Design a protein around this ligand. Structure first.
Ligand code: 9X4
Length: 291
C-alpha cells in the first residue's frame, strides 16, 4: 500500500546516519518544504512488520518535543523504505556541544534542553512507549530553537527473524546498566526508566562534550557500564541542583531510579527563571553557527 515517492519527495543531501540506513535532508516537491528522510534497504518480506512500525510512528509523534511523522514510501529497485518526518534544521545537540567554545554548554541551556527531552519522554512513557535510544544525536534543534526527539523504538513483538534494519547495535555509551545482559541480568530489558539514565548521560555530554567512557572501545564500555558506579561530572563548577539532577538520572539500580514525572519536578528542571533568555541565546547561537 506504500506508494513510490517520485514527484512527492526528493532527497537533497545526507544529514547523518541512524543505527541502520542514512538520514537525508529531503524536499516536498510541490511546496519546496524540507523534511528529513530515513532511507533503509528493505526486502519484500519485511513489509508486514514495517506497516506495524508505521502506525506506531503515526500515533506517538503528535507532541511538540517529538519530530512530526509525515509519511512512508517504498522506492522500487533490494527496495528502499523512506520514512518522512519533520526537518530539524539546526541539527543534533551532539553538534551543538561540538561547535561550542570549550565543548561545554551553559548550565541554564542544559536545564532547558533536558526538560524538553523529559517532556518528549513523558509523552512516550504515558503511551507505554520506551524511546530505547536517547543520546545527543537523537535530540534535535529546529531553526527557532525548538527541541525534538527522533528515532524512538517501534520494533519487536512479532517473534520473527529480525529484519536487516534491526540487526545492528548502535553506540553503547548512553545505555542504562539494566539493558546490558550479564550473568546476574540474563534477560536485560528496557524499562521506561532506562530512558532517564540516557537523559542523564546526555546532560553530561552537554556539560563535557562527550559521554563518560568515551575514551574506551565500545565493547569495553558495554562491559563496564553494569559494573561501574554511577558516572559523575568531572568539574566542581556546576551547581548543587545540576549534580543532584545527574544523581537522579543516574541511579544505578533502575528500581530506585525516579520516574519521568518525578524528574520533571526536580529543582534543576522545574526552576528555570532565565527560560525566556535561554531560548533567545540558543536561537542566536543557531544563526551564528549557520554562517
Ligand atoms: C539536520 N537534521 C538532522 O540531522 C536529522 C533529522 C531531522 N529530522 O532533521 N533526523 C535525523 N537527523 C540526524 C541523523 C540522525 C540524527 C537521525 C537518526 C534517525 C532518525 C529517525 C527516525 C524516524 C524513525 C523516521 C522517526 N523519528 C521520529 C519520527 C516520527 O520518525 C532521524 C535522524
Amino acid at each position: 500500500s506504500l506508494r513510490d515517492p517520485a514527484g512527492i519527495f526528493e532527497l537533497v543531501e545526507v544529514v547523518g546516519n541512524g543505527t541502520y540506513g542514512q538520514v537525508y535532508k529531503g524536499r516536498h516537491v510541490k511546496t519546496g518544504q524540507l523534511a528529513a528522510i530515513k532511507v533503509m534497504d528493505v526486502t519484500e518480506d519485511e513489509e508486514e512488520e514495517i506497516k506495524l512500525e508505521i502506525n506506531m510512528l503515526k500515533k506517538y509523534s503528535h507532541h511538540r518535543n517529538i519530530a512530526t511523522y509525515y509519511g512512508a514510501f517504498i522506492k522500487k529497485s533490494d527496495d528502499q523504505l523512506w520514512l518522512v518526518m519533520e526537518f530539524c534544521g539546526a541539527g543534533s545537540i551532539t553538534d551543538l556541544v561540538k561547535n561550542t567554545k570549550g565543548n561545554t554548554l551553559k548550565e541554564d541551556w542544559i536545564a532547558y534542553i533536558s526538560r524538553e527531552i523529559l517532556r518528549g519522554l513523558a509523552h512516550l512513557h504515558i503511551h507505554h512507549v520506551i524511546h530505547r535510544d536517547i543520546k545527543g544525536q537523537n535530540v534535535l534543534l529546529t531553526e527557532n530553537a525548538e527541541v525534538k526527539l527522533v528515532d524512538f523504538g517501534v520494533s519487536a513483538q512479532l517473534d520473527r527473524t529480525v529484519g536487516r534494519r534491526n540487526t545492528f547495535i548502535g553506540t553503547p555509551y548512553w545505555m542504562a546498566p539494566e539493558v546490558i545482559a550479564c550473568d546476574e541480568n540474563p534477560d536485560a530489558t528496557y524499562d521506561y526508566r532506562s530512558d532517564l539514565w540516557s537523559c542523564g548521560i546526555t546532560a553530561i555530554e552537554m556539560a563535557e562534550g562527550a559521554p563518560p567512557l568515551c575514551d574506551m572501545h565500545p565493547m569495553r564500555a558495554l562491559f563496564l557500564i553494569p559494573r561501574n558506579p554511577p558516572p559523575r561530572l568531572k568539574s566542581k563548577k556546576w551547581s548543587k541542583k545540576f549534580f543532584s539532577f545527574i544523581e537522579g538520572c543516574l541511579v544505578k539500580n533502575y528500581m530506585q531510579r525516579p520516574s519521568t514525572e518525578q524528574l520533571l519536578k526536580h529543582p534543576f528542571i522545574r526552576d528555570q527563571p532565565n527560560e525566556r533568555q535561554v531560548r533567545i541565546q540558543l536561537k542566536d547561537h543557531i544563526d551564528r553557527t549557520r554562517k
